[PDB]
Design a protein around this nucleic acid. Structure first.
Lengths: 150, 129, 143
RNA sequence: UUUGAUGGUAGUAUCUAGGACUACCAUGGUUGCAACGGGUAACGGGGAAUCAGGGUUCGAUUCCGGAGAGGGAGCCUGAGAAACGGCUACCACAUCUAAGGAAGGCAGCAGGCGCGUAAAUUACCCACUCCCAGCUCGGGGAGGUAGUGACGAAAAAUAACAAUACAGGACUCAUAUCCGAGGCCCUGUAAUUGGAAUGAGUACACUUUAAAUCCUUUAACAAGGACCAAUUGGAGGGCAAGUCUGGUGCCAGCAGCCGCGGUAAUUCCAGCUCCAAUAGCGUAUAUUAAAGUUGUUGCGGUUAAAACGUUCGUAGUUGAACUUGUGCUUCAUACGUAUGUAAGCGUAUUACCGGCCGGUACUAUUACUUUGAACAAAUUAGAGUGCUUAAAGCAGGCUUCAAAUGCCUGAAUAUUCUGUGCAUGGGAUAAUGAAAUAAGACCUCUGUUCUGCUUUCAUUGGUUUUCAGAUCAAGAGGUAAUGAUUAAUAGAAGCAGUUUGGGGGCAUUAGUAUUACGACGCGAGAGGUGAAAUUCUUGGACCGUCGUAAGACUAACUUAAGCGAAAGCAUUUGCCAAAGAUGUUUUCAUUAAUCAAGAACGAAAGUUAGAGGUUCGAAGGCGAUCAGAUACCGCCCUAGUUCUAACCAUAAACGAUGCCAGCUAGCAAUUGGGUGUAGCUACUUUUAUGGCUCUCUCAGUCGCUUCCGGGAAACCAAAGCUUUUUGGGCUCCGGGGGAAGUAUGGUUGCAAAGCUGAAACUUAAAGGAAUUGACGGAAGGGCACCA
RNA sequence: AAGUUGACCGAACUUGAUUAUUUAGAGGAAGUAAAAGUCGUAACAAGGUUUCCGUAGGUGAACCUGCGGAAGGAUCAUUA
């Protein structure tokens, strides 16, 4: 593992075999609709909505309580992001390495960490322009980029 | 990364029978590789194996006898017609008494004795003797 | 070790063995044009010439004998080489500035044994087949 | 690509398409899947040489195709030529000439010169096969046919049968590692001698053929070795074969390599013998096999030659699982058993008529694969066949010794011309494809919208509806389980996440030390070293001491710990940005793997430009030692070490070991995280925490022990799973040693130099891991009056 | 018919550039063979200053020295 790092450590979620459990849920299964988007209107990316509802409702996995995933439910409401989330956070990192480098030069090991994160924004761009959620003519230019993520 | 499931479940068989274990755990059982063992099951080499059905990719816990000697895969899957099927049994299998080279012919997954009577050709999928 | 074992790597394989045959000393010897530029023989088995001088090559030690060679200028491109004559006798049978036929020695161009540098061997001298006049079945003409 | 390159457009031109040519617009076209350029000792293909396969090398050469007639250009006539056994000119060579001029092209067949290692007669005829003409009849150095011919293939002279002569073992038997008789189921050497065969020659005639020759067929002649007379290489090993005899004496020479030879040579030179293949065989160059030393089958890269210093990274090469799978009922079918052809349930594997059966409407795709089609022969594979056999040949055979259109059958089938392309079967494997707030499907078949045109308005015209062959859109609000596979012990990203680490940057700050100076006490020494001297004491040194100041370096704690891509990283504290790992019923959904080119970093030294300048210290200058000492040792020191802003791009940049992935074992430690130990345990009260305890658990890293491991070993849980030439994927590098990382070109650089990178010539060994001796500034343990 | 005007094919020579080979060269400097010459002993034994590497400077010559690295070392190391 780790395309840009040595550390081959494995860790993930272990989703069980049973699907439709909770067998104890208080309300409708599809009343997570009006709490995916009511916390989607607070600017939360669907990673944060997948874990804020593990503890209040507390729903286990959304793709078994409803029919489909969290990102598909938000654009059924109409809260899909301008740029998808694993590029929104991958660019905000590469923004911050450049803002650290416009005051702290002599640093050839924060610069190296920028070439890493920029060589993989160019790998998620090169894929999202194939599956057509990013259009063509969409590049990483690092002079407009800081007004996207902020 | 795994460019074959068939290599990462046939060396895993072959490494566990030269030590003489009686059960091998293979991962993660493409239906290509189930019908490879089913060729080997009905010629005695393999016991009645069990497919644990977890809904990610699958796992098999394959029983075996100990009659196996070398059960590997050929890669890349060379397309073999019928007239050049014996250039791949001569230089590969130990003698023309026994052993098989398994083919994925146009009809199914079969060995090289059933394919030469049914008159089918295909790709080489692996070998066992 | 190495080689790409994918289905569509016939491009790399024939590229590689073309690339890597140029390390072999036997391939590249016959594929560089020096059987005419470096070979004083014209890429061929024999050559004819006219001699210059009858000389003694000092043999490489442990062996120690002056070796009685002949330095000849072949007429094909004027290059001046040194050939070895066998089978003692063989220089009272030469009588300098007779036309000689010269061949190789045996190790496919380069030098052979105790004689350093000398790579060629005299076959006929004044048409009368030196191996046959050595056993006196042919006589060299007094003309 | 000005001067046609890519296209459009109109033309011209040609037999015709066409930038083929013109004019006007357009700016295209090819390219790392190798364009362009160069080389070629390149005519292409059929095919040839050689191997078990996979293959390498060659093909001027009789067959098809192209090409050209000394070099180029032009052209006439002709259906056909840019023809040269046609012409015209120029160029180069030559020719004749009475000096005005005229003609010539053998890379046709012969022949001569020349070059060469390298290749034959200045012969005979159109009978053959066919071609051409006005064309049964002419012509055809096309073609056939003799002469030369050891290129190469085939069949095979150089004796054979007996006798005694001298002789061997063996058979019977006196006898048995002694010995006679029948010496013999033996074979040799015999110019003993005497016999039987014969083609080699020879010669009448014959057949032969266009006329011949040769062979075959042949009346007469023709073998006794002294001749009809077999030689080429070798006799140390590799390699089957005299430790023969004379000669020479590291000479002469031999030997592919290893090796021989120095007045005994198993290797030379000869004699006497012997062994190999034999009308042959030796040598030279090339080439194939040998070669698992080119590696697709099938190599090697820790140490033998070889993982880029590091990581990104495009081209490229490779890429997780998932979809109608079968079950029953059966019956056809090898022996209550076996369906291996098929038929019946998973709501409809394509609608009609014909008498289960045919016309018949309809076919997501490509790779692969089945059988085909399709196409030259010779070759090759090779069927059949007594040219006497043979290689060949495509004939021949029979009734039959016949009479006899009197018969019979030939003259296969294939690799090849491997692939492309086409037809057909298959649908395993592998890609693409589809339905997302539906420009989704059938439907709501609504007529809202269509498109159109042939049949009739007798003919023929106007009014205009229907079927409208077809084609757009349906009255959209209604009837379709109305549509999104998994979530990889793949990746990515997140987290109310808790952390953790000499990771990098910037500030801040501490520690003693080493200097250098200031005071003060002291008194003649002090540095140093093998011994020294250089050196420091105008004594106030050395030393002791309080100090101030400066630049360096961060000890001890310090590990078989940690972090980092690698080079590297250690005084606190703050701030900055980043990272692995663990945890996670988080998120996305194949985004991943590795990598030419290209990018970023890259110890030290060296280089630039400043600021520093303690310690150290190449260079330099002294003192010793030493035969010598430009060295080691000792003194002050310079560039440098230091910081900044750039350059450079190399290290034994090492684990001499590329990266992702799966598997295979013990044993003990520790780094980090998690989770049960009322295991202990610090005390707010025990609890909350912290410390450890054993017990688990991830990612490992160390360590040691041996495999069912492997290797030449040393050795290694990888360097193994490289079976019984094996196969998870990707990339780089090597092919005996030198010459040499040189020369040269290109490129980078301020330079130093870096990344690329040969050949001539030389060489029979270089090298790796181990073993025994050697038994030395190698440690250990011992011994002796030759200590 | 000659002869002619203009176009177009164009040989050919003269000049320039561009390649692609081959060759003469004072001097200079590396390599190989040649052991049997001179000088010293660099390395391998703790080769008598352990060796090697990268990099700079210096030296009749092998070599020397600084800085950094490695063990292919003469330490796999015992020091709560």
């Amino acid at each position: 593992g780790r395309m840009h790092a040595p550390g081959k450590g494995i860790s993930q979620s272990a989703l069980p075999y049973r699907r439709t459990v909770p067998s104890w849920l208080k309300l409708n299964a599809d009343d997570v609709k009006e709490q995916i988007k009511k916390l989607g209107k607070k600017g939360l990316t669907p990673s944060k909505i997948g874990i804020i509802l593990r503890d209040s409702h507390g729903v286990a996995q959304v793709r078994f309580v409803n029919g489909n995933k969290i990102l598909r439910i938000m654009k059924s409401v109409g809260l899909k992001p301008d740029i998808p989330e694993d590029l929104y956070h991958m660019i905000k990192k590469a923004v911050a390495i450049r803002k650290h480098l416009e005051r702290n030069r002599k640093d050839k090991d924060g610069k190296f960490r920028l070439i890493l994160v920029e060589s993989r924004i160019h790998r998620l761009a090169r894929y999202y322009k194939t599956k057509s959620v990013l259009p063509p003519n969409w590049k990483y230019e690092s002079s407009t980029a800081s007004a996207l993520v902020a | 990364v795994r460019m074959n499931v068939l290599a990462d479940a046939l060396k895993c068989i072959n490494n566990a029978e030269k030590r003489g274990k009686r059960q091998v755990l293979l991962r993660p059982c493409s239906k290509v590789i189930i019908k490879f063992l089913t060729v080997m099951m009905k010629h005695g080499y393999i016991g009645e194996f069990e497919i644990v059905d977890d809904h990610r990719s699958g796992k098999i816990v394959v029983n075996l006898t100990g009659r196996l000697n070398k059960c590997g895969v050929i890669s890349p899957r060379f397309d073999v017609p019928i007239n050049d099927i014996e250039k791949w049994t001569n230089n590969l299998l130990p003698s023309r008494q026994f052993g098989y080279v398994v083919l994925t012919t146009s009809g199914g997954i079969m060995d090289h004795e059933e394919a030469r009577r049914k008159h089918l050709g295909g790709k080489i999928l692996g070998f066992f003797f | 070790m190495g080689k790409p074992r994918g289905l569509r790597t016939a491009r790399k394989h024939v590229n590689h063995r073309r690339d890597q045959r140029w390390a072999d000393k036997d391939y590249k010897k016959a594929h560089l044009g020096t059987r005419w530029k470096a070979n004083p023989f014209g890429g061929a088995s024999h050559a004819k010439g006219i001699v210059l001088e009858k000389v003694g090559v000092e043999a490489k030690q442990p062996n120690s004998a002056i070796r009685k060679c002949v330095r000849v200028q072949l007429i094909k491109n004027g290059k001046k080489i040194t050939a070895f004559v066998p089978r003692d006798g063989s220089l009272n049978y030469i009588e300098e500035n007779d036309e000689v036929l010269v061949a190789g020695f045996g190790r496919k161009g380069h030098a052979v044994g105790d004689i350093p540098g000398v790579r060629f061997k005299v076959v006929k001298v004044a048409n009368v087949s030196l191996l046959a006049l050595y056993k006196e079945k042919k006589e060299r003409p007094r003309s």
